[PDB]
Motif scaffolding. Structure first.
Motif, PDB file in Angstrom:
ATOM      1  N   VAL A   1       2.428   9.961   6.128  1.00  0.00           N
ATOM      2  CA  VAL A   1       1.776   9.838   4.847  1.00  0.00           C
ATOM      3  C   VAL A   1       1.200   8.431   4.675  1.00  0.00           C
ATOM      4  O   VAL A   1       1.811   7.440   5.084  1.00  0.00           O
ATOM      5  CB  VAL A   1       2.703  10.264   3.679  1.00  0.00           C
ATOM      6  CG1 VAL A   1       3.941   9.390   3.606  1.00  0.00           C
ATOM      7  CG2 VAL A   1       1.970  10.273   2.348  1.00  0.00           C
ATOM      8  N   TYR A   2      -0.007   8.351   4.126  1.00  0.00           N
ATOM      9  CA  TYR A   2      -0.657   7.060   3.898  1.00  0.00           C
ATOM     10  C   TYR A   2      -1.568   7.113   2.699  1.00  0.00           C
ATOM     11  O   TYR A   2      -2.025   8.168   2.319  1.00  0.00           O
ATOM     12  CB  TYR A   2      -1.420   6.566   5.142  1.00  0.00           C
ATOM     13  CG  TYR A   2      -2.475   7.522   5.659  1.00  0.00           C
ATOM     14  CD1 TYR A   2      -3.772   7.488   5.170  1.00  0.00           C
ATOM     15  CD2 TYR A   2      -2.194   8.406   6.688  1.00  0.00           C
ATOM     16  CE1 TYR A   2      -4.758   8.319   5.684  1.00  0.00           C
ATOM     17  CE2 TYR A   2      -3.157   9.277   7.173  1.00  0.00           C
ATOM     18  CZ  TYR A   2      -4.441   9.224   6.672  1.00  0.00           C
ATOM     19  OH  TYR A   2      -5.409  10.042   7.197  1.00  0.00           O
ATOM     20  N   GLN A   3      -1.870   5.960   2.133  1.00  0.00           N
ATOM     21  CA  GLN A   3      -2.729   5.848   0.979  1.00  0.00           C
ATOM     22  C   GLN A   3      -4.148   5.504   1.425  1.00  0.00           C
ATOM     23  O   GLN A   3      -4.321   4.613   2.260  1.00  0.00           O
ATOM     24  CB  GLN A   3      -2.130   4.793   0.040  1.00  0.00           C
ATOM     25  CG  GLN A   3      -2.803   4.738  -1.298  1.00  0.00           C
ATOM     26  CD  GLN A   3      -2.409   5.832  -2.244  1.00  0.00           C
ATOM     27  OE1 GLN A   3      -1.674   6.763  -1.914  1.00  0.00           O
ATOM     28  NE2 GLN A   3      -2.901   5.736  -3.451  1.00  0.00           N
ATOM     29  N   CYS A   4      -5.145   6.237   0.886  1.00  0.00           N
ATOM     30  CA  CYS A   4      -6.597   6.229   1.148  1.00  0.00           C
ATOM     31  C   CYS A   4      -7.383   5.948  -0.149  1.00  0.00           C
ATOM     32  O   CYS A   4      -6.868   6.100  -1.243  1.00  0.00           O
ATOM     33  CB  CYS A   4      -7.025   7.607   1.689  1.00  0.00           C
ATOM     34  SG  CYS A   4      -6.834   7.813   3.466  1.00  0.00           S
TER      35      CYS A   4
ATOM     36  N   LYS B   1       0.893  -1.146   0.000  1.00  0.00           N
ATOM     37  CA  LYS B   1       0.000   0.000   0.000  1.00  0.00           C
ATOM     38  C   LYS B   1       0.945   1.213   0.000  1.00  0.00           C
ATOM     39  O   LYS B   1       1.420   1.651   1.047  1.00  0.00           O
ATOM     40  CB  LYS B   1      -0.875  -0.004   1.254  1.00  0.00           C
ATOM     41  CG  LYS B   1      -1.945   1.087   1.278  1.00  0.00           C
ATOM     42  CD  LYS B   1      -3.002   0.958   0.199  1.00  0.00           C
ATOM     43  CE  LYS B   1      -3.896  -0.260   0.358  1.00  0.00           C
ATOM     44  NZ  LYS B   1      -4.485  -0.393   1.713  1.00  0.00           N
ATOM     45  N   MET B   2       1.257   1.699  -1.184  1.00  0.00           N
ATOM     46  CA  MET B   2       2.233   2.750  -1.379  1.00  0.00           C
ATOM     47  C   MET B   2       1.591   4.096  -1.520  1.00  0.00           C
ATOM     48  O   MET B   2       0.636   4.255  -2.277  1.00  0.00           O
ATOM     49  CB  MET B   2       2.966   2.447  -2.677  1.00  0.00           C
ATOM     50  CG  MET B   2       4.323   2.995  -2.726  1.00  0.00           C
ATOM     51  SD  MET B   2       5.093   2.316  -4.192  1.00  0.00           S
ATOM     52  CE  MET B   2       5.466   0.716  -3.644  1.00  0.00           C
ATOM     53  N   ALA B   3       2.189   5.085  -0.885  1.00  0.00           N
ATOM     54  CA  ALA B   3       1.744   6.459  -0.996  1.00  0.00           C
ATOM     55  C   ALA B   3       2.694   7.211  -1.917  1.00  0.00           C
ATOM     56  O   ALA B   3       3.815   6.765  -2.141  1.00  0.00           O
ATOM     57  CB  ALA B   3       1.719   7.112   0.375  1.00  0.00           C
TER      58      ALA B   3
END
Ligand SMILES: *CC(=O)N(CCC(N)=O)[C@H]1CCS(=O)(=O)C1
Ligand SMILES: *CC(=O)N(CCC(N)=O)[C@H]1CCS(=O)(=O)C1
Lengths: 304, 304
Positions: B125-128, B5-7
């Motif tokens: 930072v994170y992916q949504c 799960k890449m940002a």
């Protein structure tokens, strides 16, 4: 509220990424001050990787054979040296974007962010854990070598990993910034099997505390256990043994939630023995082990 | 190999984050060119949030009441205006770190990265994904408002989200950069229940393709289905209906793997009907829906 697999903001590291080319091989380099750090296998062709003699290959290389490009501008190489499995290319210009930094060699179970790069350019950022078998389960394609893992404390970047290899099983191996591989891995394209990938017990407990803080409480039970009883169960399920050091590190989470560490161990024991029964914890259907107790406290308090 | 799960690398956005304070309320602002964008509820006390009249509250505010700080230096506010649910504070200095940017209003099912900030400082930072009920499942504490969601195409940052609210259920709601909320949500502390959180079917299929590319193939079966047959199953499991537009978008993944989209739908149908039987796909025990077909192609090809 909410709990996510969060990575550190990658800007400070983005400013350090460069492209290094030697002959026909191109990978990523890390430019800090007037030194560019990159995997020594930049001097190898894919054929050399089968059985490389790095000292012998390096003799045929001069400063002008290492092409270092930062953005669209070329850095002048004025020295080179091999330190373990990394090359240190001395350049004539200090990186103006050099953040405050340290080189740290992490322990298994510790987490960090990876800035995946190709041709010196960042593609993405994600959060990883150094597995107890010293591999990382990353996302790396050819050309990603030289991408780095790091942690940030306010303004200081602690670089802990540099990507070097993909094992035949699809898991990843690399070095600290002194060029020493984590685990028994070598920079050679040969049979390198990984040992048992055990679960990081202290991290799973920390994530269970994060779940309780965030409202997911169905798994809390009426039971308790002892460290020795819990560890009999942990061994059966390939979980790392829990020590009093781990209990101590979980102290702040235990205090914030009012759930004694051994009571949380008893909930974990039942989750191991009975499974999740089709239920989820923090949006996951398995027990997550890539959040340390420090990560949980940090995320649950908003440390910047 | 490997799938994470890449940002997006967050550096370009980090350079835009500022702190905005009005009275006793402090949140994050986005500084692009000579304008600072922030949620209009910066003018509210927690008491005002119960039933705010933003136009009336804004009348009592002048330029000097909006304190904008970028790093440790203060920006001079020379104008302010309300556009839907955001305030635009005109400052006398163009942000020197302004990247190439666009404001985009995304569709449900689309993914993006969030740079969580507190006091104008990035924490992570994170992916949504924008859920089909127009909520996001983020990680936001008090003071995170004004943090933004974005996508990056080479050097262009497309800002798509600004954080405003946490619903009583712990899910998150916000606006595009024009200040229009996604979904029916309002910037008021009142009963705002979310609709059914359906699964983003096209994304699950894309992630199943990513699994096949990366070696996880146990779920491939000998069956096929039709769009109408698949959709009868999708409706039963609260999955979004799959359209020919979705099949078309999955075309490159279908071509790369040699697995026809309807054959992958038949594997998905069996996974819905039979479950995972204690197995995992790309390290997950549930069907992941926060990777679009574009994300899978990007990650599986190393786009920088
Ligand atoms: C450039 C690099 O990191 N390599 C591995 C690529 C992946 N997928 O991690 C490259 C280094 C030696 S190797 O034989 O592992 C190929
Ligand atoms: C500052 C902010 O974003 N708020 C929500 C905080 C979380 N946890 O998302 C703040 C805006 C109005 S509110 O009543 O949702 C509290």
């Amino acid at each position: 509220s909410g709990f996510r697999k969060m990575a550190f903001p990658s800007g400070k590291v983005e400013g350090c990424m460069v492209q290094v080319t030697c002959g026909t091989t191109t990978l990523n380099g890390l430019w800090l001050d007037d030194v560019v750090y990159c995997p020594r296998h930049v001097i190898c062709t894919s054929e050399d990787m089968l059985n490389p003699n790095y000292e012998d290959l390096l003799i045929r290389k001069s400063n002008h054979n290492f092409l270092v490009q930062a953005g669209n501008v070329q850095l002048r190489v004025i020295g080179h040296s091999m330190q373990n499995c990394v090359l240190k290319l001395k350049v004539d210009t200090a990186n103006p974007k050099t953040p405050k930094y340290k080189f740290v060699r992490i322990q298994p179970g510790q987490t960090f962010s990876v800035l995946a790069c190709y041709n010196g350019s960042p593609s993405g950022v994600y959060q990883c854990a150094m597995r107890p078998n010293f591999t990382i389960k990353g996302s790396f394609l050819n050309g990603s070598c030289g991408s780095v893992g790091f942690n940030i404390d306010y303004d200081c970047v602690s670089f802990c990993y540099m990507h070097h290899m993909e094992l035949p099983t699809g898991v990843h191996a690399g070095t600290d910034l002194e060029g020493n591989f984590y685990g028994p891995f070598v920079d050679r394209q040969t049979a390198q099997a990984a040992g048992t990938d055990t679960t990081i017990t202290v991290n799973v407990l920390a994530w269970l505390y994060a779940a309780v803080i965030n409202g997911d409480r169905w798994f809390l039970n009426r039971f308790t256990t002892t460290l020795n009883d819990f560890n009999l169960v942990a061994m059966k399920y390939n979980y790392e043994p829990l020590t009093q050091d781990h209990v101590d590190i979980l102290g702040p989470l235990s205090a914030q939630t009012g759930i004694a560490v051994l009571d949380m161990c008893a909930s974990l024991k039942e989750l191991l023995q009975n499974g999740m029964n089709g239920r989820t914890i923090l949006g996951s259907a398995l027990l997550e082990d890539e959040f340390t107790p420090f990560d949980v406290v940090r995320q649950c308090s908003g440390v910047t």
